[PDB]
Amino acid sequence: GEEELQENQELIREKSN
């Protein structure tokens, strides 16, 4: 869940624009 918790906030900002 950790990778989908805080780390998800990175890919949703960058890998989503």
Curated annotation (Swiss-Prot):
Q: Which cysteines are joined by disulfide bonds?
A: none
Q: Which residues carry this modification: Asparagine amide?
A: N17
- Site residues (Important for selectivity), renumbered to this chain: L5
> Which residues get modified to 4-carboxyglutamate?
E3, E4, E7, E10, E14
- Chain intervals with Basic and acidic residues compositional bias: 10-17
Expression tissues: Expressed by the venom duct.
Tell me the compartments it is located in: Secreted
Q: Which residues bind a divalent metal cation?
A: E3, E7, E10, E14
Q: Which domain of life is it from?
A: Eukaryota
Miscellaneous notes: The mutant Gln-9 consists of the addition of a proline residue which is hydroxylated (4-hydroxyproline). The mature peptide does not contain cysteine residue.
Function in brief: Conantokins inhibit N-methyl-D-aspartate (NMDA) receptors. This toxin is selective for the NR2B/GRIN2B subunit. Induces sleep-like symptoms in young mice and hyperactivity in older mice.
| Similarity comment | Belongs to the conotoxin B superfamily.
**Name used for this protein in its record:** Conantokin-G
Q: Where does this protein come from, organism-wise?
A: Conus geographus (Geography cone)
